[PDB]
Amino acid sequence: AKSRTIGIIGAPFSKGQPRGGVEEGPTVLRKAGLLEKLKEQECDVKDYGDLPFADIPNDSPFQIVKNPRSVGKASEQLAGKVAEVKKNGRISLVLGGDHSLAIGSISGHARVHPDLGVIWVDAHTDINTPLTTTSGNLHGQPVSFLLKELKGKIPDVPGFSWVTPCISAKDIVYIGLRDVDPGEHYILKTLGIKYFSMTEVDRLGIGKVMEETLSYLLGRKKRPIHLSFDVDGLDPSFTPATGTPVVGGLTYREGLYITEEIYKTGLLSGLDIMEVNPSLGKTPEEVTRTVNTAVAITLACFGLAREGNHKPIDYLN
Amino acid sequence: AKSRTIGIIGAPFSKGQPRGGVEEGPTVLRKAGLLEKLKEQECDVKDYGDLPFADIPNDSPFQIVKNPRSVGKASEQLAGKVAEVKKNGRISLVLGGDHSLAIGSISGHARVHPDLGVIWVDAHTDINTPLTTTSGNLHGQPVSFLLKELKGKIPDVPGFSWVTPCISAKDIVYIGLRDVDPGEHYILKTLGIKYFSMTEVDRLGIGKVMEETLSYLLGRKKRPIHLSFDVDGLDPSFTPATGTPVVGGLTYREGLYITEEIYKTGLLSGLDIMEVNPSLGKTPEEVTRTVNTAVAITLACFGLAREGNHKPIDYLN
Amino acid sequence: AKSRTIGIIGAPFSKGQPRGGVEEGPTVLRKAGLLEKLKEQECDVKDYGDLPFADIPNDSPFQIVKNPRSVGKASEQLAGKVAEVKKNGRISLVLGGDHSLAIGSISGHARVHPDLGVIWVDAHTDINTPLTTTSGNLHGQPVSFLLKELKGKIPDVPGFSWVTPCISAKDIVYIGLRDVDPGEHYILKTLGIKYFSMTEVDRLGIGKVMEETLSYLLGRKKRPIHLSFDVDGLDPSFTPATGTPVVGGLTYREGLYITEEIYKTGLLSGLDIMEVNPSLGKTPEEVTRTVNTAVAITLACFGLAREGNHKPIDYLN
């Protein structure tokens, strides 16, 4: 099946944020048995390995924006890799690494399918511009670089001249929001982006959130879907080993519902599994808990259903 | 009152599964004061005691199916006892013991009430046949022995000759499914059984789940309800002292919501409280958490309401 | 804005209940940065300080009712301070303290705004009379002293002659009930008070619960809202440092949802944050979790939103 044909890209990159260890995300996700578990689920899985992100020593800040040439290059190289996987007729599965890699993931995916819709699962909007940012971390800015409506608001940042905005504000849905910067909230409301913060999930229930998200993106016409999943989207009781955890997040069941509903569309075309940082567990079990939840979210993206699964064979004879 | 008139049956049996200690379930539920608490809730309680299960020597497996004669005999004795309690106009309350016992519990109940409707609360379907099973554990096959649609599809297993299928595929509703084998999923779809897996619970909310469940079974006219409750139906954060725990289960709130709604119909006729394993707590608190939850569940089946309860007197006088 | 104009009142009182330490509630809430966080959120914060509760020796019990004179005087003092805060055009914010103080807080609020409607967030109804109580603790009786319908059912208790019932049975909505005494349940049902016990919250979801509460209180016409928040309304996994924790409570997310919806009406006029007991946390982390949750609850009442907030300036300019 097209929805079960995968191209794995490891992107061990941490310089979009300050905490070391997120670069081990591809390693810990593979060691958890992701490839084997995917193959046991009737998936055709090709592993493109981990991208080498050669050191860029001498990468001074652009204003408060840290490591820009390193972040820019990593995303530029990932865009080329994602485009190759997309050309090979596979669902690009990016194992991060920090969320700044979404710049490259979505840009690369958009080169092959320019009509893609984005579902962004995260505690954060990640829509700061290099000028609205207060943390100066590029993993909090990927969405600003990608939006057509923000053209003329993105300054000339070293390492990013290759970027052209590919998604319109109307082609993205956020799910999970609970830690939005003032500057980010201004952008979000002014651009009229469709979002379901934790308030909307509490109000509507995840059932209605998915119904509305999939109608908003696919109601006009069936188009490819890019799911960009930041593990901090789930509550820290499920994915504690992450850089910026925020209280009162999506439950384990809610994360599974999102991905089960996205799978069922048969339109998943690109997936990012980001922000798993195995050096940030408070204990060894918090790390295994984080990686297992990330694996479980991923398997549901490729067909694993809680109601059960069977092959097209007669089990009674 | 009929809905508060009970016959307690201890069923200290474990040989339907490989983990020892589930036979101690009737002991710890009794120790927690289940009987006294029910009597304090205006219930008429008659205790039929704990069934003696004789150790069957040379109980050789049937193909990969472990302990067949032991599981078949325990269910045979339990069917006779449930039928006796049912004949005395009481709600049979089986304290397990592993879920293979539901063969005896439901068969016995159907001998007095053949028009009964089953509600199965569990992470599992337990509908494997001796031929579709992969674990070979009989606590994962009771539904197959009971279904009229699977007559001719169940082999002649030693100890099960007394079994007569007593329920149709249309007479059962599952709630809480999240760990269903491919053969079980195939049976579940091909027979068109009604189920609310964790996916349906997330989509609908337990309110709509219970509305639809009760309308599906009762819509035609009032009929007896058999609730077969496996504590692993609830999330391991509420019932960790169980043999087969599965992540992402029904919350403590949802478990209470199911049972409070069933009580309200006034049609509860048979109840199974299964799979409590006090030797499977990682800490003594995990055992008490499990036992207290299983008691709360049972109390709600017989009238205990979170909004409160009052004796029919004037409290303001 | 008026919905962001606050009058802080500390109420270090514990004699409404038998567990020491709840008088330290205004201290830890202050130490947590409450005032500073409200100011950061564009709030006009005036601190009216901590009320002085003078010791009353030889305060013999009325029948089984403990410390009556102490409770009576504390509420009497609070009523005058809340009435003063209300006349100065500010939302009253009472930092508790045990819930008996609600007598004082609501009576004082009603002196300036008689048409007020109450939303009572708690696991308990706190509607026992001095005659129906079984514990003898006045923190479980505030609602009965405030109700016009129970006028004639409240005996003459030492310290309470100043009390005039200011609310009808129709002007109050309960949210979170799950430990109601038989006497309270009789009161709740006979007076026909509107309530959302955990059962109703499970049935409908917090979204519908809030739509239902507000339509019931504000339907007829716009009126001032008094939110009396007992931290034990939320589950003990979120607010463990409380005197009367009850399992299966409101989630952290439901807590925030209730308060975000109350803020949006723009009609909040009185608030009580009660039963924070920093001496009851099993660990230092259990105290900080209860405190941080209580602080988060308070900020949402004054406009802190999970989708984000921004100032009326152009962030892109």
Ligand SMILES: O=C(O)C1(CN2C[C@H](CN3CCC(CCS(=O)(=O)c4ccc(F)cc4)CC3)[C@@H](c3cccc(F)c3)C2)CCCC1
């Ligand atoms: O642009 C970005 O970088 C992002 C947006 N961030 C938001 C952050 C503000 N935000 C306030 C609330 C805080 C409390 C969260 S909590 O859930 O109460 C908690 C507390 C302690 C704990 F151990 C665990 C959890 C968490 C931090 C803010 C920032 C962070 C750091 C320097 C700074 F000047 C500005 C910008 C997008 C990409 C990542 C972050």
Ligand SMILES: O=C(O)C1(CN2C[C@H](CN3CCC(CCS(=O)(=O)c4ccc(F)cc4)CC3)[C@@H](c3cccc(F)c3)C2)CCCC1
């Ligand atoms: O028929 C049966 O026996 C039943 C059905 N199936 C289920 C089981 C497959 N099933 C996958 C998911 C596993 C749980 C994953 S987890 O939730 O992440 C987890 C992990 C570790 C932990 F400590 C706690 C929780 C539990 C195992 C399958 C089986 C079990 C054993 C031998 C075997 F060859 C085949 C049988 C019906 C009655 C009971 C079981």
Ligand SMILES: O=C(O)C1(CN2C[C@H](CN3CCC(CCS(=O)(=O)c4ccc(F)cc4)CC3)[C@@H](c3cccc(F)c3)C2)CCCC1
């Ligand atoms: O009026 C009042 O004072 C209030 C009403 N209370 C109710 C209390 C009965 N109530 C039953 C359910 C119990 C089980 C709760 S549990 O979640 O299972 C639990 C168990 C153990 C644990 F460590 C923590 C939590 C907790 C106690 C009852 C009482 C308390 C004390 C003497 C007495 F004779 C009668 C009156 C209103 C204001 C506060 C209390």
Ligand SMILES: [Mn+2]
């Ligand atoms: Mn994030």
Ligand SMILES: [Mn+2]
């Ligand atoms: Mn992110």
Ligand SMILES: [Mn+2]
């Ligand atoms: Mn079972």
Ligand SMILES: [Mn+2]
């Ligand atoms: Mn089970």
Ligand SMILES: [Mn+2]
């Ligand atoms: Mn209270």
Ligand SMILES: [Mn+2]
């Ligand atoms: Mn309370």
